[PDB]
Amino acid sequence: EEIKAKALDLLNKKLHRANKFGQDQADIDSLQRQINRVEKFGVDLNSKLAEEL
Amino acid sequence: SSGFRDFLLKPELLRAIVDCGFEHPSEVQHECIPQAILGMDVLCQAKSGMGKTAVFVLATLQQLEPVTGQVSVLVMCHTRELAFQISKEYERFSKYMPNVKVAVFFGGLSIKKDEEVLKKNCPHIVVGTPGRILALARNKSLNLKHIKHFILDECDKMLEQLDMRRDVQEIFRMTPHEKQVMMFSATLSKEIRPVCRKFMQDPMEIFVDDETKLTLHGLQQYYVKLKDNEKNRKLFDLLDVLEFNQVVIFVKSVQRCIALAQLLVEQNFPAIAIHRGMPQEERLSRYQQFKDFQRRILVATNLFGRGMDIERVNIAFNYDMPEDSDTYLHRVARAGRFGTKGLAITFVSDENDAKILNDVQDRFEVNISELPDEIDISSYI
Amino acid sequence: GFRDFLLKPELLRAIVDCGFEHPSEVQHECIPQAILGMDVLCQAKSGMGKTAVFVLATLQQLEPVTGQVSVLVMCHTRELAFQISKEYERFSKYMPNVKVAVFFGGLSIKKDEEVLKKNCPHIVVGTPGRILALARNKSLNLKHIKHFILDECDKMLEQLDMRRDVQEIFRMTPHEKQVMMFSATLSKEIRPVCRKFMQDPMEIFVDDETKLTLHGLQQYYVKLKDNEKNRKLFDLLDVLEFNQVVIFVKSVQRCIALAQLLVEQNFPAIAIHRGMPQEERLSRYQQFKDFQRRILVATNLFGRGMDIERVNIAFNYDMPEDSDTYLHRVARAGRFGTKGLAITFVSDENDAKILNDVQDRFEVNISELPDEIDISSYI
RNA sequence: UUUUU
RNA sequence: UUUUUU
Numbered sequence A: 001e002e003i004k005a006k007a008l009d010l011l012n013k014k015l016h017r018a019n020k021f022g023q024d025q026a027d028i029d030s031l032q033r034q035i036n037r038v039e040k041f042g043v044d045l046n047s048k049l050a051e052e053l
Numbered sequence B: 001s002s003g004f005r006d007f008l009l010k011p012e013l014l015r016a017i018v019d020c021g022f023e024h025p026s027e028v029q030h031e032c033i034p035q036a037i038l039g040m041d042v043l044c045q046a047k048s049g050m051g052k053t054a055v056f057v058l059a060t061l062q063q064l065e066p067v068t069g070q071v072s073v074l075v076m077c078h079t080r081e082l083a084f085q086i087s088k089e090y091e092r093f094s095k096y097m098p099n100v101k102v103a104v105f106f107g108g109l110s111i112k113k114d115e116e117v118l119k120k121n122c123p124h125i126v127v128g129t130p131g132r133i134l135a136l137a138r139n140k141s142l143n144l145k146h147i148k149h150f151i152l153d154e155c156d157k158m159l160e161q162l163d164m165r166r167d168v169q170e171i172f173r174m175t176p177h178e179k180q181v182m183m184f185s186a187t188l189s190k191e192i193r194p195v196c197r198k199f200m201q202d203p204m205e206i207f208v209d210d211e212t213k214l215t216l217h218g219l220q221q222y223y224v225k226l227k228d229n230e231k232n233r234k235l236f237d238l239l240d241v242l243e244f245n246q247v248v249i250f251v252k253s254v255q256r257c258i259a260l261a262q263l264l265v266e267q268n269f270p271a272i273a274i275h276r277g278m279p280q281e282e283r284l285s286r287y288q289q290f291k292d293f294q295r296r297i298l299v300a301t302n303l304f305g306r307g308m309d310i311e312r313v314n315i316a317f318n319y320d321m322p323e324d325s326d327t328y329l330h331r332v333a334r335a336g337r338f339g340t341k342g343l344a345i346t347f348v349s350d351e352n353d354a355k356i357l358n359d360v361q362d363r364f365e366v367n368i369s370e371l372p373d374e375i376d377i378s379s380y381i
Numbered sequence C: 001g002f003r004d005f006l007l008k009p010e011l012l013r014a015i016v017d018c019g020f021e022h023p024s025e026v027q028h029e030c031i032p033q034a035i036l037g038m039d040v041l042c043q044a045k046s047g048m049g050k051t052a053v054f055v056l057a058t059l060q061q062l063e064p065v066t067g068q069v070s071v072l073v074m075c076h077t078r079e080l081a082f083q084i085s086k087e088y089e090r091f092s093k094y095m096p097n098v099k100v101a102v103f104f105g106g107l108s109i110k111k112d113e114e115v116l117k118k119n120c121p122h123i124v125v126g127t128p129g130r131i132l133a134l135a136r137n138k139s140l141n142l143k144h145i146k147h148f149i150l151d152e153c154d155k156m157l158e159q160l161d162m163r164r165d166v167q168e169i170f171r172m173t174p175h176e177k178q179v180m181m182f183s184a185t186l187s188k189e190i191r192p193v194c195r196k197f198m199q200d201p202m203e204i205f206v207d208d209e210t211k212l213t214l215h216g217l218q219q220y221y222v223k224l225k226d227n228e229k230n231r232k233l234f235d236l237l238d239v240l241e242f243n244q245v246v247i248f249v250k251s252v253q254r255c256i257a258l259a260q261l262l263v264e265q266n267f268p269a270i271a272i273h274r275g276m277p278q279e280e281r282l283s284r285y286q287q288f289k290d291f292q293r294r295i296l297v298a299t300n301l302f303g304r305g306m307d308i309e310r311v312n313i314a315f316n317y318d319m320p321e322d323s324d325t326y327l328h329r330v331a332r333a334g335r336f337g338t339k340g341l342a343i344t345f346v347s348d349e350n351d352a353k354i355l356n357d358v359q360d361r362f363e364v365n366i367s368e369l370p371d372e373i374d375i376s377s378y379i
Numbered sequence D: 001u002u003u004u005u
Numbered sequence E: 001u002u003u004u005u006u
């Protein structure tokens, strides 16, 4: 769960910076779709989202 | 008190049922149990997930007189996991009968462990799959000449298969001719009633011949039309919006089962898979963690399509169309156990997919609405 | 107040076109004397319009002759020379018979000779190295120049190599000419060096250096080790609203690495430094001034002269080497008295000594950065 | 698709 | 160090 909360911190920054610096709207939705999925579930170590880890 | 008292069961059996939390029997239990404990042969068909297992578990335990070193009850089914489920169910109802011993036998695990169990600690009740059981009988490790009760669960599927039918016939021959025979299923094709009938003398017949009542009117069942490419993306969106505790997703092959499970994992869906070809110890560990609610998403072949009783499965997915309306009715039944509410979503890909879904819609007098974009959380749980 | 200067009506028309409503202090003091052809040694506050002083004064005196170059302007960086040339075009909007040209290294010299031979300008802006090369091979004729301008003159003459090149360029020019030099910093030691190029010039000095600070700038610092610099900057770039920032480092290698790391944190950062090809340098410089990008990482190449309107924050990721560099660097933001923000990373004790040297010399306060600040107070 | 090897 | 024809 220490991985879970700190995975949310990396996404809450990528999403924040995407908004702040005019990112494509597809990227905003893709990040948010991943954030809400990570909250509804855990962090799977074999997932491709584990690239950042 | 009231309810289960009508049967006059053994007190240690009734104390077990109390610890199970059951309050009143289902119609199949009220109708079938009192005759079953008399020794009668029974051919039983009843609504999916309505308590068929407890019927033959309670009746065999009621009639059972334990004889040390002697197997008196044989129960068989079509999948290894189902035999495992039935064995543990025997354990929970024999909780207050310490002398009763139960064992389960199936392939994928060393036969010497099964042999060592038989020759060192012989059970009174044996549950298992036709292959391993027949192997142990030919082995002479399993002495089947003391059998007083012969039980088949999911019997129509077990007897629609001639290679499995001949195996159960060869197993049936090595048992005494005077004994109880009981067969259970939610589906009983009019073709296969005689096939089960040849195994019994004057059986009680529980039939739901007019299939108006085979539907689970506590389930909302919808469908979506889409391409194969759109199947994955639609599945991803549905798993995101729909709230659930557990989900079972059914595919039509081992290849599809492995690929979808891997694809779900890479999208950060904590999905597990179960199918033949896994090491048996591994698919037992994966069956248990799903049953113990340690995994939310299960992708399975038709291996998981019958008999599996998972408490918290809220949604059933037909990622691939079921082969027939028989397989459809059992897979959807994996949600909404004992008449609770649940959800069933079916993917219609090609012509044959809509062909089958119109068959099941007609056969059961059921409505399958096209899936709306918003569903009440109160609706399906 | 620009009417009183007695400028040419086209020149006055250009002033109103770019929106100037009132001359600055340095424009009031120097322009009338510079119109008359007097030598001027000018020191003035950062970003308060020194460029307009020598652009307008030379454009006023210019009597274009088709075959010859009359005004030469030099500075220390290529991008500053580019900026000055576009500033001449801006104020030559209504003087169509005036031609300007920029020559600096990193681009083919044959193209510079091509523009000289085929369409010779009246005003040349350049950097001393390329100008010297064009003058030695005789493509550039310096025998007609009547105005000789040095911008950022102290930095241009404190470099002995660059001073030697400027001196050789000067000796190729007529004795009868106007020489003007501009900067925001004029040390006691460098003033005679500038004066040796001039004859009885008007001298504009700022000897009370407390009025060289821009009181419209909020100036803070954070004590940090080099390990902690990277993410303190990351969070500051997240928290602070801004239109544009410039992030200064102490070396080309650090400029490349920090910019690359910022992009991988998905900050759309760009970098300018020596070693970038000049086409990439110019195109990168142009888009930053075109408001195409918000985050610029730079060496001291961008540390003085650069005039980008919407730079609200200036970051000292690495401590500037001395107080002059700090003064010019921090002044890339808040141009012409507007409000900006200045943040300096202090790494070791020597950095603190440099910071203390700065606040003593300018009698300015650099307080520690508070945890949250108001957006209006620096915008 | 499932059922000893 | 940074910057300045090569």
Ligand SMILES: Nc1ncnc2c1ncn2[C@@H]1O[C@H](COP(=O)(O)OP(=O)(O)O)[C@@H](O)[C@H]1O
Binding pocket: B021, B022, B023, B024, B025, B026, B029, B047, B048, B049, B050, B051, B052, B053, B054, B307, B308, B309, B337, B338
């Ligand atoms: N009388 C009862 N009251 C409540 N729950 C019951 C009763 N009988 C059985 N159940 C539960 O219903 C679930 C499904 O029973 P199961 O025997 O697997 O259904 P079937 O074999 O008919 O598909 C099981 O978890 C079982 O514990």
Ligand SMILES: Nc1ncnc2c1ncn2[C@@H]1O[C@H](COP(=O)(O)OP(=O)(O)O)[C@@H](O)[C@H]1O
Binding pocket: C019, C020, C021, C022, C023, C024, C044, C045, C046, C047, C048, C049, C050, C051, C052, C305, C306, C307, C335, C336
């Ligand atoms: N009178 C004025 N009113 C408004 N802005 C001015 C005025 N004079 C100059 N500026 C602007 O100030 C900005 C910076 O001037 P600049 O000449 O680069 O300052 P310095 O060279 O003294 O550091 C330029 O964008 C210029 O247009």
Ligand code: BEF
Binding pocket: B047, B048, B049, B050, B052, B185, B186, B306, B307, B308, B333
């Ligand atoms: F018919 Be049940 F689900 F075994």
Ligand code: BEF
Binding pocket: C045, C046, C047, C048, C050, C183, C184, C304, C305, C306, C331
């Ligand atoms: F001194 Be100014 F910023 F050119």
Ligand SMILES: [Mg+2]
Binding pocket: B052, B053, B153, B154, B306, B307, B308
């Ligand atoms: Mg069952």
Ligand SMILES: [Mg+2]
Binding pocket: C050, C051, C151, C152, C305
């Ligand atoms: Mg300037």
